[PDB]
Symmetry: C3
């Protein structure tokens, strides 16, 4: 129907002890504010307002970025002074027309696990019972901090008492206020006009509209959500880590039911935007971050961190730290491999142990197996780079590119002093410093000939164990 | 006594969403079918039949392999059409003589944590009470999917109702059918001849023989196992990961009571065939896979993956990815070390940081400390390989071997272009390309002499910060 | 007040199956005995005695070391024969004056999570109720092994029955004896003089003084601690790992409330002496060990192990194994970096992928990015070490030092054969073996010139795919 959702992100969040605003702390690839705005946008409300207190100039541009990603307008109201949650709703009420007749949903920006289904059931129950206010509730083993729900024996809601304003008998109430409301626009404005600051924290409690609307004879309703994590709030980093662990278990479980093997979900972190193909095995200690895409029948080996990495089908990424890179079908990466942004490994390519690639395009079937740095280079198809090689892309002042052809066989400890081009099918010997272009089919060497200095050990290392091993060898 | 166990592995397992059959999905080093057949074989039943539906030609050879490992015959019956668990038992009943007089135990191939003790207590209780059928039961917080146990107030078993055929009041029953049965051969055949397909799934429910045998006046018994994990079944990958985590905790706990320190059992995976010595410390992020053998007083450092690796006593394997290798007593491996198949590190040997070994035998006390690839090589005792060295074992067409003597001291950045032999006590200078044999006690060099081009920086890098550091140095 | 605490560390701890004494097994950076003695010393008792049985000569020096660290005297009594906990207290009673009039607290050396607050509430309750003996109790789901608390319906304590001396009805008691006592010095000595060895284990049960003092009309009190982990004991390595995991969760949670982001507390181990600055992010798979100090706004990346490493502010330590090193402000370390003792990385320095440093001082802004070993070296400010370089610090017999100036630009695959000095602003070409000093502003090369052997591939690799790629290139 015609609804308007308001997100209250004006709280200071002092218990986070962070120079970064609370609602912008991230989990599973999105900030808490981004998590809330994503779920609200999936219901497509007619209006959406975000109330910001201080840190408003630091958070407001990120609200506009989310408005661009979700493809709609997201208004922003600003609370001048921290006068409580009631005053914050009144600030967000100025961003609507004074003649607004739709429902008004109130939420906070620190409930990251809140989904569109819980909000849909909130407005659905709100309409089905024809209530003036519907509040979301849940039951916790520790109801500390939250506002307590006061109900009579017939389970009808009487009021909500805050933690700072609760008697010891009321502290024992384990049904808590989730902070997600659904109002009638007219009945709400009437309540907040009658709010009193005569409380412990000396603020305008939005929670007091429950009792105010009860004294008016209006229908007061509370919808109890059993899944407490969906409505849990974040005030400290301990709760942020708890909700991040819970959200990660649900993300991993969804991939498993889709056909993805996650050996150790406890030590496997997967962001919300990550896609994994069918019959892919993910080993412990792995984090899938950002917009990482894993194809089908892959093996993302243990202790692998991937951020915005696109991997094709049937590839193996074992013990790899990569970001902003592409890995083709059937490619083998790892173990102990470092992928910097700009890495495009072709299909059936190999980047082996102790190899670092940065801003390089390596064609189909080319292998870089051992102890090599590949920076700002272009390598063809079905080539082979010897071990202990380096693509020298820094002359001390600027960066230069290197071009390597197809079907080449470069020797071990080959230094490519860019800019240098290596033709197709070319060879370089072991220990070659390539400073000039190598034509196709040529062999490039530079190392001097081998010189053997006989019995040098017995003359310069006389009392050494090696001198005795050589003296005993002459027998 | 005289028993016959039948494993029903004919289910499709559609909720796994895998091109691999369900019962062949692995955990703790064995497939689910291998886990079940291992426990059954420890009781030594007279007959053992495995019922297979589709995927039968893909699973049947693996049943014969398990028959070879467990040293006995394992028969295989095949269900032509998926007509339910009752028809599957009838298919497996054709693999016995028609005059079989022993007990008949029925199990499934997706209960990997089932052990021989639970099966022994099943047949023992079955004999002690003289029942015609004994079924294993357990109590779960979520009894969904499982068949519900219907008992009267005197706890006598009446029937088993499937999830698809259960009233809402019967769904609330939390005592579930574990799927492990123990029958009388004659009383069983009589039941399955009277099965009806008039149910929701239109199949022959083996569970219906509980009520059929009750209507015959036969003794019906249910044995309740408190340890629900021992009889839990796998249908999706989420349950496969849950049981794998539970089985791993029990494997780790057994090692700890035997004298093995596991710092973080949550992030330590140990397969069932792994043996670890007394007073060995295992650090977080470690996986012990396959037939890996760890000696006593070892330190398997953090983030170490070992598959079929044999490590002696008093060795340290820190941050190492190894497979099909041997590590001698007192050897030091890691951190960041890659061990390929064929690696035989002698006692008190060292393979240090960023070292990869493949199909190489390195003698006692030899050290390969830094940034070295050792492939297809043989190194003697008490040698020392300089850093940044490479054993060149690939000339572009074939692979060649390298031989290194004892007590040698090879310099840094030494390229061993195989085939090359290095005598005992030999030396090679830094930056040497060894293309010919080095006699014992000789020194092999190849690098050109050092040439200093004075004030080259001020001429070719004029406006650089290095030119100002050199201009200021002349003071 | 005037108190005397006695720690009973005389037990054999046979279920640990360790050649190391039980109380010296470590967790969170301290042994169990060190954990107990640290909490006791925070209350500053007048006397402190540690009772040791066998392993006494192996544990006693570590008690004196703790006496030095905590800045007070810690006496040591020795139990000649394992005659039970009652005889052990009598042995520790000989280390006091026979005229001691203060309270006497008895504890064990295998309760590592015991803090000074629990001990303070023990003596406070002991004084407030004027009891002759106060014992700490808790409730467990599995009370096995522990001594059971026998209370009447008015909750008054009657006696403590050991596990070996308990009837089946007494085994069901879930309130257990924590083993932490508080005695009156006179009432205690009177009890232990009346102890009888007529029990199952044939020992002097210190627990029997509860019933003895009850038969004397003395006030017997039991203080129930709800937090069972604070008083839990260790007898096997399974319980040692459980308490280590619990203690780590509390250490991590304290850092989070202080302003430290711990993404995965389950896979993040932090020792008790570690300090972490505000707004530092710690990624999964990380262990902070020893006296490691992390500054503010840092990023300790995933899979990082740090022991006694001091990191400044705004630095990044990703995928790094380091120990006994210092990392300056704004420095970037990792991924895949090995820091050996003696490493002093200046501010804004860089130690990149596959780099190992050992006993080296690298100045401000100097970068060592790829595949380099730096051992026993001194590098100036704003220098740059090329990839695949090695600081040769071992001539086969002894170790030599290397000196590198400021603003230098050393080329890739440069071998520094120590002892060698490199002046400020100097350059070295790729593939240079530096055996002599390089003056400031000079360029040091040694590699021979490049030689191209045309169509060598078609002559020496005739039937190879590279020969066809070169034959097709001539078009
Ligand atoms: C572990 C891995 O990843 S391996 C992957 C990379 N593979 C390699 O490193 C392969 C390295 N192999 C080599 O360098 C070998 O020396 C090869 C393949 C060049 C051998 O080539 P050959 O067939 O022996 O060449 P041949 O002897 O016919 O002549 C080549 C010429 O170049 C010179 N030369 C050959 N190899 C080298 C070298 N490594 N360094 C310097 N000069 C060399 C020779 O002196 C000879 O010159 P001359 O005979 O005119 O004086
Ligand atoms: C970090 C680590 O892992 S270290 C482990 C491995 N250790 C090493 O790398 C040690 C490397 N050390 C070297 O190469 C040294 O140069 C040493 C040990 C050879 C020095 O040897 P010296 O006693 O100086 O030899 P000396 O000067 O008597 O004569 C040796 C001859 O070989 C030549 N030579 C010596 N070293 C080298 C070298 N590194 N490259 C090329 N040629 C060399 C010299 O020119 C000299 O020839 P000439 O005098 O006839 O012209
Ligand atoms: C991936 C990374 O980490 S990069 C980090 C480290 N960066 C590097 O490795 C840079 C390496 N760059 C080089 O070695 C280049 O060859 C440079 C910078 C020396 C080029 O210098 P140039 O301006 O070409 O020198 P120029 O040609 O004027 O003369 C230099 C002399 O030294 C010789 N020389 C130059 N480079 C080298 C080398 N790499 N090996 C051996 N000799 C060399 C030349 O033969 C020339 O001698 P000549 O002309 O008298 O016969
Ligand atoms: O497989 P190995 O022996 O480790 O590796 C060797 O052969 C490979 C091809 O087979 C080459 O790409 C490697 O350069 C070489 O070191
Ligand atoms: O111990 P360091 O200095 O890291 O290592 C150095 O000495 C070792 C012997 O002591 C040698 O094996 C290494 O090649 C050398 O780099
Ligand atoms: O940043 P890159 O290209 O990986 O690294 C390159 O430039 C750096 C400076 O920008 C240098 O320190 C490195 O030696 C060089 O390899
Ligand atoms: Mg090298």
């Amino acid at each position: 129907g015609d609804t308007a959702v308001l997100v209250l992100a004006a709280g200071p969040g002092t218990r986070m002890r962070s120079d970064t605003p609370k609602v912008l702390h991230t989990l599973a690839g999105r900030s808490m504010l981004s998590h809330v705005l994503h779920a609200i946008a999936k219901l497509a409300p007619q209006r959406l307002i975000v109330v910001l207190g201080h840190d408003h100039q630091r958070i407001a541009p990120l609200v506009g970025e989310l408005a661009d990603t979700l493809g709609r307008t997201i208004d922003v109201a600003l609370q001048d002074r921290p006068l409580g949650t009631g005053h914050a709703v009144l600030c967000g009420l100025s961003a609507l027309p004074d003649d607004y007749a739709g429902n008004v949903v109130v939420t906070s920006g620190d409930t990251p696990l809140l989904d569109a289904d819980t909000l849909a059931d909130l407005i659905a129950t709100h309409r089905a019972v024809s209530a003036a206010v519907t509040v979301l509730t849940t039951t916790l083993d520790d109801p500390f901090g939250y506002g307590r729900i006061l109900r009579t024996q017939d389970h009808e809601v009487m009021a909500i008492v805050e933690q700072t304003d609760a008697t010891p008998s009321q502290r024992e109430i384990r049904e808590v206020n989730a902070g997600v409301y659904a109002f009638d626009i007219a009945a709400l404005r009437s309540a907040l006009s009658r709010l009193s600051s005569n409380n412990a924290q000396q603020e305008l409690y939005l929670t007091d509209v429950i009792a105010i609307l009860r004294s008016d004879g209006q229908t007061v309703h509370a919808s109890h959500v059993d899944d407490s994590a969906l409505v849990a709030g974040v005030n400290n980093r301990v709760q942020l880590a708890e909700l991040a662990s819970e959200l990660n278990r649900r993300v991993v479980a969804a991939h498993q039911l889709a056909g993805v093997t996650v050996v150790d979900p406890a030590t496997t972190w997967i962001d919300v935007d990550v896609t994994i193909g069918r019959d892919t095995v993910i080993h412990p200690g792995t984090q899938l971050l950002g917009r990482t895409q894993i194809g089908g029948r892959c093996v993302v080996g243990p202790d692998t961190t991937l951020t915005d990495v696109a991997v094709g089908d049937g590839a193996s990424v074992v013990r790899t730290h990569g970001s902003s890179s592409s890995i083709g079908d059937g490619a083998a990466v790892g173990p102990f491999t470092y992928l910097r942004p700009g890495t495009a490994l072709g299909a059936d390519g190999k980047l082996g142990a102790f190899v670092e690639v940065k801003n390089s395009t390596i064609g189909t079937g080319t292998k870089v197996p051992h102890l090599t740095y590949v920076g700002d280079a272009d390598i063809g198809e079905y080539s082979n780079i010897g071990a202990s090689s380096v693509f020298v892309n820094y002359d001390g002042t600027s960066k230069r590119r290197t071009t390597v052809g197809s079907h080449v066989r470069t020797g071990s400890d080959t230094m490519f002093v860019a800019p240098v081009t290596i033709g197709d099918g070319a060879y370089t010997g072991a220990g070659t410093v390539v400073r000039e272009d190598v034509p196709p089919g040529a062999l490039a060497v530079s190392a001097g000939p081998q010189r053997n200095i006989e019995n040098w050990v017995q003359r310069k290392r006389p009392g050494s164990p090696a001198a005795q091993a050589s003296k005993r060898a002459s027998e």
